[PDB]
Amino acid sequence: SHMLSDEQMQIINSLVEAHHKTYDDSYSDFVRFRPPVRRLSMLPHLADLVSYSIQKVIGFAKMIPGFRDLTAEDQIALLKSSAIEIIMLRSNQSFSLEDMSWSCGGPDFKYCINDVTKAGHTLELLEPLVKFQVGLKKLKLHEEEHVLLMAICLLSPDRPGVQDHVRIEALQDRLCDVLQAYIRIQHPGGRLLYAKMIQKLADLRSLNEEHSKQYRSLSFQPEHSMQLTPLVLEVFGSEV
Amino acid sequence: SHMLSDEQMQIINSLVEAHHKTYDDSYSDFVRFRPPVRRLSMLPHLADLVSYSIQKVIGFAKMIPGFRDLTAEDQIALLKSSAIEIIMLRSNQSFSLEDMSWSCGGPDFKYCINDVTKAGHTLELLEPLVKFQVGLKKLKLHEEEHVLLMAICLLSPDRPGVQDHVRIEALQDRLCDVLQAYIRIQHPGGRLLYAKMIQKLADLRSLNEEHSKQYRSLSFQPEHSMQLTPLVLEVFGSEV
Amino acid sequence: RHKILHRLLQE
Amino acid sequence: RHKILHRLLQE
Ligand SMILES: CC1(C)[C@H](/C=C/C=C2C[C@@H](O)C[C@H](O)C2)CC[C@]1(C)CCC#CC(O)(C(F)(F)F)C(F)(F)F
Ligand SMILES: CC1(C)[C@H](/C=C/C=C2C[C@@H](O)C[C@H](O)C2)CC[C@]1(C)CCC#CC(O)(C(F)(F)F)C(F)(F)F
Ligand SMILES: [Mg+2]
Ligand SMILES: [Mg+2]
Numbered sequence A, B: 001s002h003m004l005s006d007e008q009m010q011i012i013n014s015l016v017e018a019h020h021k022t023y024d025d026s027y028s029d030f031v032r033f034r035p036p037v038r039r040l041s042m043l044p045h046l047a048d049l050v051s052y053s054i055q056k057v058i059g060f061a062k063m064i065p066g067f068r069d070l071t072a073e074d075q076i077a078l079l080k081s082s083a084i085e086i087i088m089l090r091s092n093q094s095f096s097l098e099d100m101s102w103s104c105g106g107p108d109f110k111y112c113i114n115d116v117t118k119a120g121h122t123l124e125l126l127e128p129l130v131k132f133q134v135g136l137k138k139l140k141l142h143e144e145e146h147v148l149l150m151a152i153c154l155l156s157p158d159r160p161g162v163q164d165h166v167r168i169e170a171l172q173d174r175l176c177d178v179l180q181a182y183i184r185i186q187h188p189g190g191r192l193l194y195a196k197m198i199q200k201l202a203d204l205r206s207l208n209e210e211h212s213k214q215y216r217s218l219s220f221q222p223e224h225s226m227q228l229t230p231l232v233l234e235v236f237g238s239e240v
Numbered sequence C, D: 001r002h003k004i005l006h007r008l009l010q011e
Helices: A006-021 A028-032 A043-061 A072-094 A113-117 A123-138 A143-154 A165-186 A193-220 A230-236 B006-021 B028-032 B043-061 B072-094 B113-117 B123-138 B143-154 B165-186 B193-220 B230-236 C003-008 D003-008
Strands: A101-103 B101-103
Touching: A006 A043, A006 A143, A006 A165, A043 A072, A043 A143, A043 A230, A043 C003, A072 A101, A072 A123, A072 A143, A072 A193, A072 A230, A072 C003, A113 A123, A123 A193, A143 A165, A143 A193, A165 A193, A193 A230, A230 B230, A230 C003, B006 B043, B006 B143, B006 B165, B043 B072, B043 B143, B043 B230, B043 D003, B072 B101, B072 B123, B072 B143, B072 B193, B072 B230, B072 D003, B113 B123, B123 B193, B143 B165, B143 B193, B165 B193, B193 B230, B230 D003
Parallel strands: none
Antiparallel strands: none
């Protein structure tokens, strides 16, 4: 009944290309992380996984149409507040409904709930997490929709620290359009998908909040914070 | 012609035991460091080697008779300024005159000058380093003398940041005694050894100074400092 | 200060 | 601040 506009389509080519450039389905770079071990035994390996991911999320972000033109401060503000959410969204790519875990190799790079516990996190986080991963996986998103959801999550103007919350609101809306249009046109059987997707964003906030609290506690214990990486400390730190 | 006193001897048992407790001749813990790779390719692995060593040097220090009774500030001040020197001294244990390198396994955990270069250091440091390692190895120190030299180096009152530089001067002298006495009594053929040993301390300062400058440069480049560890950043940082 | 972040967001 | 160092020098 319709068809995406040239502009919208070029945006999709950019996000998809950006993701391919910042996400390897082989997970070959994991051999460079401190090896996993199953007190907080998995902390070193997971800290490295997360850190590596932030580096990847930043690369993606820099390629989101519009982002580069924001003030470094807002880029930072947005990255800092959404980082963890973007990592949870992209992680879905490795999540397996089969064994309810992230399989990036295995048995060495297969991450179960138990493992994340050995990194200092509880079921109060992991419970909703896997639940979110499952529900999200069931949506069978087209790569195009997966990349949009990520770009949309990052440009949420409702982030603590954001300045020009009006230009951010605009860009997120432009992307929300392309996503809505795309599902209507390219997604057979997807009429309530959009709704289901925006809802996922809301579930992300709860996961984020929980993670932040659990992170703060871990963060204050020097014997544990010393296992983290400088970038993780910077991105998740309370630093103004 | 003499014989160590009971007190001096108990000190030697403490330093030797302390070293055994904080130094593994199997280097089995290295598999937990980020794997080496031969821009600054070895930086991640070596940062982890150094970091691990600081943790070990701290353990040793805490067992040096007298140290625990200093002010946390002086303990820190002493650790911060001597850390790198203690690591160079203890590294001798793994240095091989054969291949002029530190062999803690291999070929994976064998460190040549080239490798340290891939971690951001130059021959301006590595040149005197190996030279120092060689000369030091040639001294064939008894374990007892090796542990004393380390305890003596750590209690050098001439460190920037030191407060009670008089109690530190005292303790270092007490240890210098036990070392002198020991060589006279237990070291056949060692008459100029003591002199050769105190001289090594002086060579350490040059290596330290050089390392500090080279470290400072690496430290200011965020793309490199992000490869370091929180403890390394803390110990070698300019933080007052 | 976010030195690392500023550096990575730089191209 | 040397939080980590203070923590390790603690027993
Ligand atoms: C275990 C996690 C890393 C999850 C797994 C995601 C999977 C992948 C694989 C692939 O799809 C590529 C993706 O980029 C990452 C997402 C959040 C998690 C539960 C987060 C676990 C964590 C944490 C921390 O709080 C700490 F390490 F300190 F405990 C940190 F945030 F500070 F780091
Ligand atoms: C390569 C080094 C680590 C040397 C090798 C020593 C060997 C061993 C093995 C065993 O005997 C047990 C010992 O504890 C350590 C000593 C100093 C060195 C040249 C130091 C290399 C370095 C460095 C750094 O500047 C960085 F990583 F950033 F480049 C750091 F200081 F910040 F870390
Ligand atoms: Mg919207
Ligand atoms: Mg003296």
